[PDB]
Structure formats: C-alpha cells, structure tokens
Design an enzyme around this catalytic site. Structure first.
Site, short mmCIF file in Angstrom:
data_model
loop_
_atom_site.label_atom_id
_atom_site.label_comp_id
_atom_site.label_asym_id
_atom_site.label_seq_id
_atom_site.Cartn_x
_atom_site.Cartn_y
_atom_site.Cartn_z
CE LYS A 37 -3.63 -3.05 0.44
NZ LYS A 37 -5.26 -2.67 0.41
CE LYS A 86 -2.49 -8.94 -4.61
NZ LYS A 86 -3.85 -8.87 -4.20
CD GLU A 109 -7.78 -4.48 -5.92
OE1 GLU A 109 -7.07 -4.60 -4.79
OE2 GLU A 109 -8.51 -3.27 -5.92
CG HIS A 121 -7.72 -9.17 -6.73
ND1 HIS A 121 -9.01 -8.40 -6.99
CD2 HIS A 121 -7.28 -8.81 -5.70
CE1 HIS A 121 -9.03 -7.70 -6.22
NE2 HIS A 121 -8.04 -7.76 -4.90
CE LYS A 157 -9.90 -3.48 3.01
NZ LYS A 157 -8.63 -2.93 2.64
O1 CAP Z 1 -6.85 -4.13 -1.87
C1 CAP Z 1 -7.32 -4.39 -0.85
O2 CAP Z 1 -8.25 -3.79 -0.19
C2 CAP Z 1 -6.88 -5.84 -0.39
O3 CAP Z 1 -5.87 -5.86 -1.32
C3 CAP Z 1 -6.38 -5.88 1.12
O4 CAP Z 1 -5.42 -4.94 1.43
P1 CAP Z 1 -5.53 -4.64 2.97
O5 CAP Z 1 -4.88 -6.08 3.43
O6 CAP Z 1 -4.50 -3.52 3.51
O7 CAP Z 1 -6.99 -4.41 3.41
C4 CAP Z 1 -7.85 -6.75 -0.33
O8 CAP Z 1 -8.21 -7.98 0.28
C5 CAP Z 1 -8.35 -7.60 -1.42
O9 CAP Z 1 -7.56 -6.56 -2.52
C6 CAP Z 1 -9.76 -7.16 -1.19
O10 CAP Z 1 -10.38 -8.30 -1.50
P2 CAP Z 1 -10.98 -9.76 -1.33
O11 CAP Z 1 -12.53 -9.66 -0.45
O12 CAP Z 1 -11.42 -10.48 -2.56
O13 CAP Z 1 -9.82 -10.59 -0.58
MG MG Z 2 -6.29 -5.89 -3.65
#
Ligand code: CAP
Ligand code: MG
Ligand code: CAP
Ligand code: CAP
Ligand code: MG
Lengths: 123, 464, 464, 123, 154
Positions: free
Chosen positions: B167, B193, B196, B286, B326
């Site tokens: 991030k 990674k 997305e 993803h 979340k």
């Molecule tokens: O971009 C995001 O928000 C994350 O990368 C997590 O970052 P954090 O770990 O800092 O929140 C999410 O899990 C997946 O990308 C959300 O989807 P999924 O429900 O499909 O796993």
């Molecule tokens: Mg993501």
C-alpha cells in the site's frame, strides 16, 4: 523500534520463527503427525543448506530443494519415540547434517508437515 | 418435426416445465432463486428461465421442427418455496451437455445467465449453484498447478502461506515498490503482491515495477534462505498486452503472476491459465468486481458459482473472503465454497448453501486466499476457519506496524507459527485463541508492537 | 512525507471527505448511490468508497509519506440525500487521471468497482454514472467504425437497419442455420445473426456455421441487390480461439462479426475491436450477463455506465433495449444512454439519469440495437423512440410468421418502410401509430399475415 | 538397513564400485585389453577431477570430459607390464593427477575400456 | 533402426516376458552390426548390409534381478542397457542401496569376465561371492534368490 537484522537469520520454513524447539516440543510435532496418519520420513543435507539456482532459472526451477532420504519413510510406525530415535541416530553419523522431519499424506500426496529437527553447528 | 407448425405465442410452461424429468448424469443443473412478478405462476417464471436460457423464444417458430427440442431444450424440472420468504422460489433447471462449448466458461455463462435476469415477467433472479458434470469438467484445464504442485514447487508445508499487498493502492514508484517488497519479504512473508489495480500507469510502469520487484524478491530470498515470490499483475487492456507481461515475468525467472479474472474476463483468464501452465508460473486470481454480482441475496450470481467457474477456467489461488475482516462474508457459506475450491468431491449440504454434489474428477484444487482488514489478533481464527491450505494476507496489517515492514512481517510470521504450534500441541484456536497470540506477544518485541496497535479492532457489523 | 508516521486506524473521513474540492477537467468523476449501514455517517461511507477505490487501506501505513496522496487520493467531494429514500445517498467521487492505465476499461473498472461494493460498513452500493474526461477519452480506439462509416460501407441511409436472431437458440445444424439465414435475408432483413450463445458446439461447429452462412448471405445479397450481412459470433473460450474465428470471417470476406462483451470480457473485447479495426469488419456487441449487474436500483452498475464502457472498449453496435418488449427497460433512461451511445456531447440531465456532461471528443458513436419480443405492431413506437440510427431485430418476429422466413422478413421491411414514410409525410408515429401499420396490413399479404398473428400481444408489466 | 552416504563417494565409472584394484587385479585388466586387440592409452588430469558445465549447457555438452593424453596411445605394444610401467611413470611427475587407462578399438572407433589406474590423495 | 532410435528394448530371455536366446542373438546383431550374414539358425533369412547406419543399443528390461546379472552380461555384452524397475525400488533398504546392489553385481560380473571366469558356468558363485562382500548387494541376493520365470515359450 528495532532493526530486524539483515545477517545471521537464515530460516527453515515452518516453526523456524519461534524459539528453538525443546525435545518435548519437538515430540508434540511427531505426535501430531502421527495423530493424523501421516507417514513420518527423514531427510538430511550436508552441503546445500539452502536453495540455489545453478542449473536453471526457468520459473519454478530452483536447485537445492531435494534432500537425502534418511533410510525410508517409516510406514506403519506408531512410536513417536521411535522417529525421535532416528533423529538422534542421524546426528550421530551426520553431525554436520541439517536434518528434517516430514509427514506424507499418501491420499493427497502432499507433505502435510515438515520442521527442522536439527541444524548443524552455527545455524 | 411432427405436429403442425401453429404460429403464435404459448406459455413457456408448456415446454419447459417438466417435473417429470429425470436428470442425466451429463446434465448441467442450476438452482435459480426466482421471484416472479405478481401474476406469474412460479412454473411459468421457472419455464421462462429455462426456455430463454436454452432453445426458446417468445413466439412459435417453425424451425423447431428441423431439430428436436426434446434433446436440446433446457428444462425446469422443479420449483420449491423459499420457506419464509416473499414469493421467492428455487426453480431447478437442467441443461443437456450438447449445449455447451467445451473448455469455455464464457459459453456456459452466456447461456445460463445471458438474458433471463432481465425478463419483464421476473422482478429479481439469482443463480445460487450449478452442478458441473464430470463429462464437462474433463474438458477444462483448470488450474495451471493447484495446491500440491504449488507447495511442491515453493517447497512449503504445514501452515498457511503468508502474504501482503503493498500500500498505498496507487501512487508508489517503481523503486519504492521494490523497496517495500524486499522489506516485507525479508521479515518472513512468503509473498508480496500488486494491488489488483496496479497495472501500468503514469506513476509506475509495469515493466519498471516488474524489474525492481524481481531485484527485491531475489534479495529477500537469498537473505532468508526461503523461496519468496511477488505476485506481478498481468491484468491488461488487451490479450496481447496481458500475455506480453506474463512473458517478462517468465524472462525474469519469477514464480507467480496475478490476474483480475472478472475485470479481465473469462476469455482473457483462460488464455493466461494456459500460458501459465505451459510456462510454469503460478497464477493468483483477484476477484475485483465480484461483489457487484454476489452481494444481494435476491438478485445476481452467488460467489460459490463464481468460484466454481474459476476452478474451471484456471487459477492456482482465489480470494475466498475472511469472515472476520473489512469486507462481507459468512462463515458457513465460506466454508462451503472453500471445499468447492479445494476438494475432489463435495457432497451436497444445504446447511452450507451447497445445493448439488460436485464431483471434480481430479481437477486440481485452488488455494483460497484470506485478505482485507485482518491483523495479528485474527490469526488463530483464520488459522481455525481455513487450515494450512490457505494464503493469509497482510496489507495494512504489515505496512501498518509501528516499526515498518520487516518487523511487521516478523510479527505475522510469529503470530501464525504461534497459532500453528498451539494447534499442534492440541490447544483450541477457537476457545484458547486469545491467550495464544497474547502469550506470544509477550515473547516477541515485533509481535508485541503489533498487538498493542491493533488490539481494539474488529469489524463487527450485521451481514447481508 | 511530513507529519510523523502515527500507526493505527483513523476514519476514512479524515482524508477522503473533501467537500472543499474543486474537480479538475481531467478527473474521472463517479456518482455512486450509497446505502450505509445504520451507524455509518454518509460522509464516512462516501470516504470509504473513495479510499478503498484509489489509494488507501484500513489502517495507517508509513509508505504514504514516500509519495503524496494529495496528488493521488480518490476524493468524495459531496453527498446528497436521495429525496424520498431510505437512508440512501449519492456520494460523488473524483479520481485523478494519473490513476488509470491508458486504453484500459479493465483497469478503470478494477479501480472504481474493484472492492468497495463488498464493504461491511455498506449494505448496498450502485454506480450510476462516470464522467470520462477527454484526456482519458483520447486514449481509446473506440469503435472499429461507428455509425457513419458503417452506413457508408453497407450503403444504407434513411431508416433503421433491420435484423433477426435465427431460432431455436441452440440445436440447429450448420446447414439449417444457413438455409434459415438466406431465407430471412432474401425477404428484406439487412442482417441475421448468431444467438449470443451460439459459439461452437456438438450440434454445430463454428467453422461449419461460418462457411454455410457465407454461402447463404452471398445468395440473398445477389438475389435482392442489397448488401446483406450475418453477425458471426466470434465469442470463444480463449483470445486465441476468438481471434481465430475473426480471422476466418475475414478470409470469407463477410462484413460483420459479433462478440458478447460481458461474458467474453473487456480484455478480450478490446483485442477484438482492434483486430476488427485493422481488418475492417464491423463488430456487433451482445450485452449478455448485463442484467445480472444492472437490474436492482440499489446495488450494482447502471447500464449507462456499461454502455459508456463499451463505446470506449470498441463496438459498432450495442443492444440498447426496446422499452416495449420482452425485457425490462424504461423510455427516459433509455433515451438517456442512447444519447450517451451515439452523440458527441451530452449535456447533463438528471431527468434522464445523466449525472454529468459527457464530451466524447469525436469518439465514433455506436448504433443502438432494439431486440427481444418485438413485432410488427411495435414498429411505429420503436421507429419513434429510436429514429433512423438504430438496428431493430426480429427473432421470433421473423421465424414465427405463418408463411416462414422470407414472408416474415418482407412483413417487417414493409411495416418499417410504412412507418418511415408516414413519419416523413408528417404523420405522428406516437398518436397515429396504429392506423399506419393497420393501413399497410391492408395492402400487404405478408404484412397482413403477421398483423393477425401478433395483434393481441404486449409485454406490459410494472417495471423495476 | 544403511544410509548410503551422500558425501565422499565420488565415482570413476567402470569398476569404481568394487574395492580398490590391487596391482594384480589391475594387471588382469591391461591383460584383457590386450587379449582383445585394443590399443592401450593413458590420460591424466590434474584439475577437474569431474565433469562440469561452465562453457555451455545445451543437451550433451559437458565441460570436463577430455583429459590430457599421457605420451601417445602405445600402438603395437604387447607388454601388459610396459603400460603398467607408464602408470608408475606418471604418478612420478603427476602425483596429484587422476590417471586412467583406456583401450581403443580402431575398427569401431570406440573406447572399449576405461578404468582409473590411480586417484590422487584423498579420493 | 531406419526410423531412428538410440536405444530399443530387445528383450531379456531370462525375465518376465517372452523371448528366446537365439532369435534374440539374431536381431540384437541386426540392431547393432554393420553387416549381418544370413543365419537361418538364428532366424535371419537374409544378409543385411547397413552401409554404416549407426547401430542401436539394445535394452534388457522387465522382471530381472541381481541373480540374472551374469547371464544378461553374458548374452548381451557391454553394448547393452540393463534395467531394474522392481529390481531397484524393490530392494529392502530403498532405491540408493538397490542401485548400489545392481552396480556392484554388474561390476562384479564384469571383472570376473575380464579375469577370464565363465559367466555361464561360473555365474552363480560370482554374484554369490560378491553378495558376501556387499551389504547392499547381500540384502538383494537374499530377497530375490529363489525367483525365476521359467515357463515354456511361444
Ligand atoms: O486492496 C485491498 O483492499 C486488499 O488488497 C487488502 O489490502 P489490506 O490487506 O491492507 O486491506 C483486499 O483483500 C483484496 O485486495 C480485497 O479483496 P478480497 O475480499 O476479494 O480478498
Ligand atoms: Mg487488492
Ligand atoms: O436471444 C434473444 O432472446 C434475442 O436474441 C432476441 O430474440 P427474439 O427477437 O426472438 O426474442 C434478444 O434481443 C437479445 O439477444 C436479448 O437481449 P437484449 O435486451 O440485450 O436486447
Ligand atoms: O513397465 C515395465 O513393466 C517395464 O517397464 C519393466 O519394469 P520392471 O523392470 O519393474 O519390470 C518393462 O521392461 C518394459 O517396460 C517391459 O518391456 P520390454 O519387453 O519391451 O522390455
Ligand atoms: Mg440473443
């Protein structure tokens, strides 16, 4: 705040981030393996403690993953104590070996477990 | 032919409501949750869904007599009332094998969900499950690799694989990205990674990011002595662009690439799964856009179907939800589809929302990924709900640690090994949870720092 | 950087709620209709929607100081109450250009709709409109050709183009598909087409279908003396497959192909549009699956956005709805996005659901297609609602005619030419509708036959 | 059951799996060679006791196969004992050499035989 | 040998699948020799000149073990590949050891041959002798001692 050192912290996958496992602790492991039906097996390495990539670099290829089998997978064994025995048995003979213990799930064909039973001196 | 051509409209019911019907083992079956419009008998609503999904239209066409609809017609062989529910039912439809193009989720989706969701006669429609017959499963490649080979390749057993999404989402430079990567990886995460939506933008170009994260993961793997990987996002705007990127990852020797299967599409995904298979990359799926389809209990497509579809088109990992974090997602349902993702055979279990027994005739299973708003204190639950055959990802939860990435990594790696041993010694991650990490917080400076920070956080809110 | 890194969660509100904000001409703007969860202040909901859509996560990560979020953060610059609506609002978010990969609807959607629709804090989320800036429009190819060159190529002016979907849906043999085709086109239809689910199946394989439809359109074109076309479905399971079919249509010299953009995917569509552009094939888009996303007024994506998304990706034709027929669609909304599809500039008009002024900086416009459950008696309405620049399709309406395809074709050509002249003489298609075809039915044997058969049919049912 | 050691067991092809050949034993060999019509030849190597792959890795390419010819193939010789001599002769001078004996079938052009006649110290 | 192959399975005579010694001797020469004179004895009905086509290495496989060593070595000569499927992963101490077993067995045969012993007459002592000095080799001998696949041929 402290700087995670960049230098003598080579790992060994599962459990290598907790403090050195006591024989009791280690015992719990062989115990679990067993509890589950995995055939325990041993492999030791005396030269390439860690993966390399000398023969190839295609995706997925890494040299150093395969280790030497210690005897054979102890199929039918149920004495947690007996495998532990073996560990002892191998540091005797390969004092400089890295020794590990793994668990085969034969129905899925996956190593359901693996933890280092013994690092040689200074690891 | 037979029976004169008689022009004009007729209710759907007449041909596509067949309670008589005895399903064939090669039939594609679908459980649609239908909610008709006021004057619509369920068996008509149910017959429209099956007609307009297979062979028929709104009026009588002579051409039918050229072939034989008995062979081809999709058919509504049963309706069920949704106990304690607003004129809502479960129409069951069966689709003969002959109707679907082999190897193509695109085809399958075009038929089953093509036009029926917009019928004026219905007010809401939702597909809950589909039974994929072995005769259809054998026509897919499925995952480039699946659970066992992935483990076998990365040499990693007993415990969940750990990962982190760098991030901020967008805005970091090719180089910072690398830095961040190396820093998370040397700490003890298995993978880092691309978010997305990190594709190739003015702030950071895919080829630059790819070159530096390679540098970094290589640094972090040498250092720790544990195979590392960074999911490099190949999602692109054109198939040519998409393959082109996958091709570079291959050039670098890196082990896994990633792809947003729903924004990319099934046609493009399928292509990448093939490319990965032949080139030996692990592919991470993803599910961006998904909740646009799978949230409302009354209209859309349920994720368990989206999930099936992917084990069919191709993917080593798929994001399965966290229950505890979340974004939305209940435990039983999740358990249901996670077995649909990894097992060989899954027995029907309405409890868990599985309306049909699914037999995967050895198509590889996919590693579910738990991600999004989860931290150190959730460890033991995730560990519990998912088992070793899962990937647990710490975005905020890694770059969010008070001493930076390396430490934030170490915190998570310990949290998890901790939970793993508790489990193995026979502790109960569900009851005993809380002490376990609590205990470990005490012996780990990095783990501690973490604990303190996210102690009070939860995402309890009444689910949809 | 600046301002110490202070670990921990904070409300979205602090950085993504910026009512202060003055939108730049190059910002992507999005009107989301948000429905929060009980204790969620709209301005928090709205900021969650903007953060988890651009640059942030759920806790504080030091890396933000490495870049500058003022430049990159997605920002919620205003909320509005949905007059007379259950705690529902219109959060308006602004996305800086720098965040999207050029030419990629894939990337745009990955960002705007990626994860926010499944936030626990929200209970329903729906994207109603997106303002695409000219700086981002210019990065797209758009349609291979657009309204003007398609008419220019086919040599067709002053009236809606007429088409038909061969039925049954699935189940006809390559040969029979051609026979049906020749028969429909010799009658006076401009086009015939594959049903969106006709790809390549055991009952009829793509190359055999293509070979015989070519033989047939070539027969009908020669016979009538008017350029004919048969939409050949290139939708396939891999891009390689897809291109491969497109390539044979090119080899046969036929003029148009077709693609289900949603089940296919934006990645694969864009690749086809490019190929079509370079090889001069017109592309017909079938929006299968769209109602899974666009039906419910409270959750999903609205078609006007799906419609926009395609004019960017590439398509010469897109199905726009009928208002008056078998599937859902209201008149004003429709008129709304039909202008979004064809015009160069479209002034905001909340009346019609257009939340932002859209400037297309000369991207070609796309020909809307009216299809599904329409007949002879709807002619004047369709003509009215849509005007010359439309394609009106008669599936059932053609193959369901008592005297078969040829006559059923003739029936619709006359009905339409009938309406067109009425219109040109100054009659009023809306008031005078009914006499006009009624009058024609009197002079045309084929038209008659039709009138009598569908006389009593309408699809009035109270809309969603 | 015993764990074939993974460490100081480098081989040398034919015969290296039987116990060290006595001079008698060795003599039988040169004898056989001769019995057959093979031209005995000698080759020693003082630096790359085993194949490698430094200059290339295509299929079939291995660096380290060629060794240095000791003098010339002794064509026309019939004195098993004279070749033996040579062996002695070479350890004198290349004490650190690996020395090997081979036998040429000139009709088929194939080395009909090859057996190490002398490993250096600690092999 | 016309289409292309570096190795070809030639049979074992002495193991799990069908094959008689003379015939075998006959085509083995057809696989490796430059010129093969006609010998109806051995089933060769015509003289075969290969005008230098390279020869192929016959492979001996299927149901063979430690105790067949000397015969195979006898019947085939150095220019042969002898294969131990079961005979290797069938050894009491696993694969490595099993390997080692066959290697010694064969090097054993080879020297006896070279010393002038008679693999055919003297066969049996030769391996028998060696089983004495080799732990892995012994383990072997013990397990497959009583096995043969004598059955009247087709
Ligand atoms: O971009 C995001 O928000 C994350 O990368 C997590 O970052 P954090 O770990 O800092 O929140 C999410 O899990 C997946 O990308 C959300 O989807 P999924 O429900 O499909 O796993
Ligand atoms: Mg993501
Ligand atoms: O498959 C069909 O039902 C059609 O082919 C029409 O056949 P009919 O003319 O015989 O009904 C539909 O118009 C479009 O395919 C429906 O979608 P859209 O709302 O996207 O136009
Ligand atoms: O699969 C097998 O049975 C073998 O692999 C041997 O395995 P074992 O050594 O365990 O039997 C056989 O040699 C050849 O494959 C059989 O044929 P051939 O007559 O042509 O050599
Ligand atoms: Mg259709």
């Amino acid at each position: 705040m402290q700087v995670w050192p960049p230098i003598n912290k080579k790992k060994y996958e599962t459990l290598s981030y907790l403090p050195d496992l006591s024989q009791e602790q280690l015992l719990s492991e062989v115990e679990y393996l067993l509890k589950n039906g995995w055939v325990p097996c041993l492999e030791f390495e005396t030269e390439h403690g860690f993966v390399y990539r000398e023969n190839n670099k295609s995706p997925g290829y890494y040299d150093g993953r395969y280790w030497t089998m210690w005897k054979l997978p102890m199929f039918g064994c149920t004495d947690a104590t007996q495998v532990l025995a073996e560990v002892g048995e191998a540091k005797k003979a390969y004092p400089q070996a890295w020794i590990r213990i793994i668990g085969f799930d034969n129905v899925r064909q996956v190593q359901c477990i693996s933890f280092i039973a013994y690092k040689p001196e200074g690891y | 032919a037979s029976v004169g051509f008689k022009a004009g409209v007729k209710e759907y019911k007449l041909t596509y409501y067949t309670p008589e019907y005895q399903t064939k083992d090669t039939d594609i079956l679908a459980a649609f949750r239908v909610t008709p419009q006021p004057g619509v008998p369920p068996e008509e609503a149910g017959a429209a869904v099956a007609a307009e999904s297979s062979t028929g239209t709104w009026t009588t066409v002579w051409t039918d007599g050229l072939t034989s609809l008995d062979r081809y017609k999709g058919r509504c062989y049963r309706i069920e009332r949704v106990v304690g529910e607003k004129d809502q039912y479960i129409a069951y439809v069966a689709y003969p094998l002959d109707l679907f193009e082999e190897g193509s989720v695109t085809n399958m989706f075009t038929s089953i969900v093509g036009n029926v969701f917009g019928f004026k006669a219905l007010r809401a429609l939702r597909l809950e499950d589909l039974r994929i017959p072995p005769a259809y499963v054998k026509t897919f490649q499925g995952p480039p690799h699946g659970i066992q080979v992935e483990r076998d390749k990365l040499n990693k057993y007993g415990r969940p694989l750990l990962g982190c999404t760098i991030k901020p989402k967008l805005g970091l430079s090719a180089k910072n990205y690398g830095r961040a990567v190396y820093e998370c990886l040397r700490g003890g995460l298995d993978f880092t990674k691309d978010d997305e939506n990190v594709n190739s933008q003015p702030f950071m170009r895919w080829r630059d990011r790819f070159l530096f994260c390679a540098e970094a993961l290589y640094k972090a793997q040498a250092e720790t002595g544990e195979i590392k990987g960074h999911y490099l996002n190949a999602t692109a705007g054109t198939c040519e662009e998409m393959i082109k990127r996958a091709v570079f990852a291959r050039e670098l020797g890196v082990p896994i690439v990633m792809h947003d299967y729903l924004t990319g599409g099934f046609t493009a995904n399928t292509s990448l799964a093939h490319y990965c298979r032949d080139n030996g990359l692990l592919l991470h799926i993803h599910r961006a856009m998904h909740a646009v389809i799978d949230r409302q209990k009354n209209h859309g497509i349920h994720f368990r179907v989206l999930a099936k579809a992917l084990r069919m088109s191709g993917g080593d990992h798929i994001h399965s939800g966290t229950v505890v974090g979340k974004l939305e997602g209940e435990r039983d349902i999740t358990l249901g589809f996670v077995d649909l993702l990894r097992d060989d055979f899954v027995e029907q279990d309405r409890s868990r929302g599985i309306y049909f027994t699914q037999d995967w005739v050895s198509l590889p299973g996919v590693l579910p990924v738990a991600s999004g708003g989860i931290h150190v204190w959730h460890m033991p639950a995730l560990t519990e709900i998912f088992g070793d055959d899962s990937v647990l990802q710490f975005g905020g939860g890694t770059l969010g640690h008070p001493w930076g990435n390396a430490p934030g990594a170490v915190a998570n790696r310990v949290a998890l090994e901790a939970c793993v041993k508790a489990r193995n010694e026979g502790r109960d991650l569900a009851q005993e949870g809380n002490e376990i990490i609590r205990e470990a917080c005490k012996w780990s400076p990095e783990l501690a720092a973490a604990c303190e920070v996210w102690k009070e956080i939860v995402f309890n809110f009444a689910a949809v």
